[PDB]
């Protein structure tokens, strides 16, 4: 039985800039069960559907997961741009899989603010699909080298969401799980019922 519980029901989620990837392999999964397993505000599949995923074995099944704010969930979709798609987590233009999200204000916000979740704000270029950038080097926005010092034109590249329970939905935390699927001339070990 595939360890989707470990992904979806994890107690803590990754910051989007350091998004987690769990490889799924050598197990049976019930994606129709997954679909109805909770209230998901987003459950969008590209090239597949839950009903049809149960019918096939796949080769490379990945579950990526992270936290972003409500207004950014739209960026976890093929062809999107924005700080999240460009500098944190980028889906390929022709992605095969499912994007699943739910509001996690009850878990990830705190009175006084959760500043534990981070996103990359400054980057000189955009991520390739499924790329991860975990560097924390000072971003040099001007012509003078920074040499590890924060200050003027020298920015720490990450910024925090400040998750407070009284935030509007657009600024409330959302947990996101991205399921990837490939069918190759390779062993296919993640199967349905």
């Amino acid at each position, epitope marked *: 039985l595939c360890p989707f519980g470990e992904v979806f029901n994890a107690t803590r989620f990754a910051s989007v800039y350091a998004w987690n990837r769990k490889r799924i392999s050598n197990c049976v999964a019930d994606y129709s069960v997954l679909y109805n397993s909770a209230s998901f505000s987003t459950f969008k599949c590209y090239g597949v559907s839950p009903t049809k995923l149960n019918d096939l074995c796949f080769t490379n099944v990945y579950a990526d997961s992270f936290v972003i704010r409500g*207004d950014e969930v739209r960026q976890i979709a093929p062809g999107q*741009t924005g700080k999240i798609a460009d500098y944190n987590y980028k889906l390929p233009d022709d992605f095969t899989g499912c994007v699943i999200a739910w509001n996690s204000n009850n878990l990830d916000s705190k009175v006084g603010g959760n500043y534990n979740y981070l996103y990359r704000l400054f*980057r*000189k270029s955009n991520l390739k699909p499924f790329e991860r950038d975990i560097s924390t080097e000072i971003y040099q926005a*001007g012509s003078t080298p920074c040499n590890g010092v924060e200050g003027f034109n020298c920015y720490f590249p990450l*910024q925090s969401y400040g998750f407070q329970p009284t*935030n509007g939905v657009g600024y409330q935390p959302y947990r996101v799980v991205v399921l990837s699927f490939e069918l190759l001339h390779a062993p296919a070990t993640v199967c349905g019922p």
Partner: single-chain antibody
Amino acid sequence: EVQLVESGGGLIQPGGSLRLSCAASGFIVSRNYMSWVRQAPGKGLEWVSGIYSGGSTFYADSVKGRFTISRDSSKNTLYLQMNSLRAEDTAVYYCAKDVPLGSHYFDYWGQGTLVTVSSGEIVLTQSPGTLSLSPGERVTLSCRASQSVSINYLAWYQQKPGQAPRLLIYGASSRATGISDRFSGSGSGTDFTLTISRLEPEDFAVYYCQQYDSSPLTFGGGTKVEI
């Protein structure tokens, strides 16, 4: 320090095209977020286009497909190519340096260049429309939002006659650098206020609020304060 200087503009025939440029000092253009903002007599202050540090570009719906924002690394210059120009594009255009929080506000502005063409957003409502007071008096300006601005992403600008806007308040209550302490912002949710405690002749200006909670960023209509 930071300097933004537009060139290009002028009088163009409807459907013509035109390129604005913005030479910047004090930061590398191709590494920062930058924007174009325009001021038309009818539509007031209006975001036009933005470019990200990594190159992604964004456009207001009214200009999408006609305008192109770009930059030249070698010249430290931001550009705005305007094609298929319409009468409604008549405006003073500002290049602006973004503070990239929420949908962004602007701590540095260019000088403004006039272009004349011949022949779901949060709405900010400003009250009142014009005030006339004497020096030393206290004034409070209202900004009401059509939706809650949940983490106080509301800025205030001062635009003196013939000048670019100048940021006074960000985060609803934080004063920008060098701003006098008799400017005071407050409020939350949908109701924000700017208070100027002892009016001085130099305070003669229009005051604009701007929400950076949601995209696109939007400005209030302005309250003119006459002294």
